[PDB]
Each structure stands twice: as structure tokens, then as C-alpha cells.
Amino acid sequence: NSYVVIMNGSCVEVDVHLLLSYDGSSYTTYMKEEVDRYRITIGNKTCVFEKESVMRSPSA
Amino acid sequence: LAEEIRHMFHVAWVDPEDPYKGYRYLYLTPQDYKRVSALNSVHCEHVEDEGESRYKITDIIGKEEGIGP
Amino acid sequence: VASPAEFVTRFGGNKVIEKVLIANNGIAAVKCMRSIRRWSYEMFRNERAIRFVVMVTPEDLKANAEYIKMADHYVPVPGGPNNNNYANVELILDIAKRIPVQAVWA
Amino acid sequence: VGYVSAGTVEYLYSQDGSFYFLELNPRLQVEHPCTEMVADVNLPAAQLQIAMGIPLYRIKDIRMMYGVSPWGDSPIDFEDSAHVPCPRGHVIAARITGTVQELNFRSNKNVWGYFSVQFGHCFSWGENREEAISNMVVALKELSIRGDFRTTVEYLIKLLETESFQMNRIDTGWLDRLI
């Protein structure tokens, strides 16, 4: 039932079924994933977020 | 004896043209069957026999619980 | 084709169904009768190519459900839960043996 | 198992791309016309033909869909003709709450429906998703004016306009949170 969202070394435990039961009530968030953006639609609303400060090489 | 059935069954003869040749079974016409039928009264088999359609009697239960062995 | 039997031959079938006993009620029968009859009308330009035999319980008839009157033949069966009507195999058999019928649609 | 009729195989599909079988209904469902309108397949008629032993490649309903000759007898390799069918438009069914009253709509020839006495279903066809939803809106707005679908259809009419339905981003728990 439980999924733990961990912010940089923290633990908040929520559970799901997609429905999630959280603090308030059960809510619906939708996920469009991109190469470099994170694009969330929560009902009739859209919001778009950027992936961008450190330049990390991807291979050894 | 279960009168309710006694008074509505018909006879399926081995030979109608000579009764002394035995009878095959007692049965109900579908109309006669269709009335006790709702009530878990006897165990029968629907049958077509000697041309006519009969409801062949396999067991007599006796609807009064408690009048039997 | 002239009849359901002729249709079966042209298209390679093996069982002639010209009469269907309906072991059901409600909207299914209405959409189904029109749907089969519409296809049959589409196929034969005659909606009665497939005749229908129905079982009639006391409960469904007083409301005057439109599907009841479309059928070609009726046999009253005891009403109530499925153990008493549509599923009464012996009475169906009684209907099946007496007419006799060639198919059941549930 | 040697099935011989119309049937519905139900699956649950996940975002991973993994899917799971739930059940097989060995019978007709009330909402089957949805498929009939987009497939031009008369399902109860198809159920009838199968009981007569008609091979799939000889079923009329199927013949137009697979792009072949209306009267040939050539067997069709259903795998080889997988690409011929592309769905033709969209259908939406909505449960609304004699015994079965067919409510015909004057607003659209491609939309019809029913309410029964108790519950019913309405079916709205369109040339494409947008056109079918559009037809549904006018029909459901028209439907609130109808009798069997007034109280039941108001909370329902509200739910259909939400973006989630427009974007086909719904799930089994969707409606229960919409009201």
C-alpha cells in the first residue's frame, strides 16, 4: 500500500491504489514525462517544470 | 398416501389395447405436471413416450413432511 | 437467400437455426431482436425470418415491457429468481421437447 | 477451449505496458452497440451466425472491416490483415438512472439512447472523438430535459465535461471523486 517519498534523506510515507490517499483527501495528478521537463496536469490545469546547475558526465 | 398427485396422474401403458399387458408408468400431463411442479413434490423426468408427451414418475415423496417412514 | 437454412449453406455453416427460444428479458431482447432482425433485414429484407419463442414470468409483464410482444410464441414459466424461470431447464425442455425448438439464446 | 459465439475478454493494462486478464463473459453485454457502431458488426447477429457454424472469414460484419470482397469465400488470414482495420470514429456509452424506454434524439442521427424501469444506457456515435463528444454534450443537455434522465444525469453531465474525460485520462476510481 505504502510508497515513501524521500526528499534528500527524509521519509514521508503515503499509499496508493491511480489514486493516492494523502493528508487532505484522495487527489488526481497526471504525469506527462519528457526527456528534460516534468509536465503535470491536475484536473483542468496544466503546469510544466524544467530539468536543468551542475553539469554531470553520464558515463565512466 | 399423497392424494394431490393420486388425483391428477395419468397412466402410460405398455399396451392400451390390452391393459393386462402391464403399464409402463404413471405420469402427469404437462398441465398436470406444471402445478405440483413448482413445489418440489415428486421427482419425474419429462418424457416423450408412445408418441405422447408424459411426465414419468421416478419417486413419490409425499408433500406432507412426516407421513412417511 | 430464402431462409436461415439457405444462408448457412452459402457461407459454410453446419446448424440451421430458424427459431430461437429467448432465455432472457429487458433491453437485450429489444436491441438483439432489432439487431438480429436488422441484420436479417439487411440480409433478407424480412424481419421475421427468425421467429422467437419466449417464457413469461408474472413479474415482467405488468410493466408492459416492449420486448414481450415481439416474440412469436409463449410458454408461461414460474416467476421469480432464476431457479424458477429462464433457467428452469425442464420447463425449457418441456418447451424444447413440445414445440420442439432448435436453439436457445440466453 | 473451443469457444463458439460472441465473447468479451476483459483486461487491465498498466503504464509499464504490462496487461492482465480478468474474466471472459460467455454472453452478450448491454453496452455491446458501442462496438457495433464503430465496427459495423451486428453482435447479436454475429452470435446467431456462430451458432450456425459460420466461419469468421464468412461473417458479413467482419467482411467490410477487413477490406475484402463482399461475396468471396476465400479464407482470410486474420494475422496478415491486421493492418486493414483502423477504427471508424468514436462511441460513448453512459449509464443513466414498460421497463425499457428507448429515448431517440432529434439533435443527432448518430446519437440514440434509452432509460429503463430503474436504469439505462445512452449511446452517442460520431465521426471522430471530438465529433462524438460534441454530439454527446448536446444530447445530454437535451437529455436533462427528458424524464427518466433528470436527477441521475445532472451529476453525470457534470463529470463528462471534466478535462480527464476529454483527455481520456481516467481510471476505475475517477467518477467516485468527481461527485
Residues A43, D174: C-beta atoms closer than 8 Å: no
Q: List the grid coordinates of C102.
A: 432448435
Q: Is D167 on the interface with A (CB under 8 A)?
A: yes
C-alpha span between B52 and C4 (Å, rounded): 30
Q: Are strands B23-28 and B42-49 parallel, antiparallel or unpaired?
A: unpaired
Residues C15, D32: C-beta atoms closer than 8 Å: no
Q: List the grid coordinates of D135.
A: 454530439
CA geometry: angle C80, C82, C84, nearest 5 deg: 60
8 A C-beta contact, residue D73 and residue D60: no
8 A C-beta contact, residue D84 and residue D67: yes
- Among C53, C74, C78, C56, which residue's Cα sits nearest to residue C65? C56
| Nearest CA distance, A48 vs chain D (angstrom) | 17
Residues C84, B46: C-beta atoms closer than 8 Å: no
Q: Are strands B23-28 and B10-13 parallel, antiparallel or unpaired?
A: antiparallel
Residues 6+ apart with CB under 8 A from C20: C50, C51, C52, C53, C101, C103, C104, C105, D48
Q: Is B59 on the interface with C (CB under 8 A)?
A: no
C-alpha span between D41 and D51 (Å, rounded): 16
Q: Residue D23's beta-bridge partner residues? A: D10
C-alpha span between C17 and D14 (Å, rounded): 42
Q: What are phi and psi of D90, to 5 degrees?
A: -140, 150
| Substitution target from C56, C83, C97 for chain B, most B beta carbons within 10 A | C97
8 A C-beta contact, residue B38 and residue C78: yes
Q: Is C75 on the interface with D (CB under 8 A)?
A: no
- Among C52, C46, C51, C39, which residue's Cα sits nearest to residue C2? C46
| Substitution target from A19, A27, A31, A33 for chain D, most D beta carbons within 10 A | A19
Residues D58, D62, D63, D67, CA torsion sign: negative
8 A C-beta contact, residue C79 and residue C58: yes
8 A C-beta contact, residue C49 and residue C4: yes
Angle at which helices D129-145 and D151-161 cross, to 10°: 150
| Substitution target from C27, C51, C102 for chain D, most D beta carbons within 10 A | C27
Give every strand in the sheet of A30-33, ordered side by side: A30-33, A37-41, A46-50
Whole-angstrom CA distances from D121 to D100, D109, D141, D149, D179 are: 10, 17, 15, 10, 19
What number of CA atoms fall less than 13 Å from residue D132's CA on the CB side?
A: 21
- Chains touching chain C through at least 3 C-beta pairs below 8 angstroms are B, D
Three-class SS of residue C59?
Answer: helix
Residues B15, B19, B25, B27, CA torsion sign: positive
Residues 6+ apart with CB under 8 A from C81: none
Whole-angstrom CA distances from C105 to C29, C36, C54, C55, D99 are: 10, 12, 10, 12, 20
Q: What are phi and psi of D131, to 5 degrees?
A: -60, -40
Residues C97, B38: C-beta atoms closer than 8 Å: no
C-alpha span between D105 and D162 (Å, rounded): 23
- Among D142, D141, D113, which residue's Cα sits nearest to residue D125? D113
Q: What are phi and psi of C23, to 5 degrees?
A: -95, 65
Q: Is D63 on the interface with C (CB under 8 A)?
A: no
Determination approach? cryo-EM
Three-class SS of residue D23?
Answer: strand
Of all helices (H) and strands (E), which one includes residue D8? strand D8-13
Q: For chain D, give the number of residues.
A: 179
Alpha helices (H) in D4-110, listed in sequence order:
33-39, 43-51, 60-65
- Among C39, C41, C67, which residue's Cα sits nearest to residue D33? C39
Three-class SS of residue D156?
Answer: helix
Three-class SS of residue D114?
Answer: strand
Angle at which helices C26-44 and D43-51 cross, to 10°: 70
C-alpha span between D20 and A33 (Å, rounded): 24
8 A C-beta contact, residue C42 and residue C53: no
CA geometry: angle D137, D143, D149, nearest 5 deg: 125
Three-class SS of residue D133?
Answer: helix
Q: What are phi and psi of D67, to 5 degrees?
A: 60, 25
C-alpha span between C5 and C17 (Å, rounded): 7
Are there at least 3 beta-carbon pairs closer than 8 Å between C and A? no
Exposure pattern of B12-47 as b/e (b: 16+ CB <10 Å)?
beeeeeeeeeeeebbbbebebbbebbeeebbebebb
Residues D162, A30: C-beta atoms closer than 8 Å: no
Residue D168 annotated in ligand binding: no
Give every strand in the sheet of C19-22, ordered side by side: C73-76, C51-56, C19-22, C104-105
CA D17 to chain centroid: 24
Residues 6+ apart with CB under 8 A from D104: D112, D113
C-alpha span between D21 and A17 (Å, rounded): 18
Catalytic machinery residues of D: 27
Residues B37, C84: C-beta atoms closer than 8 Å: no
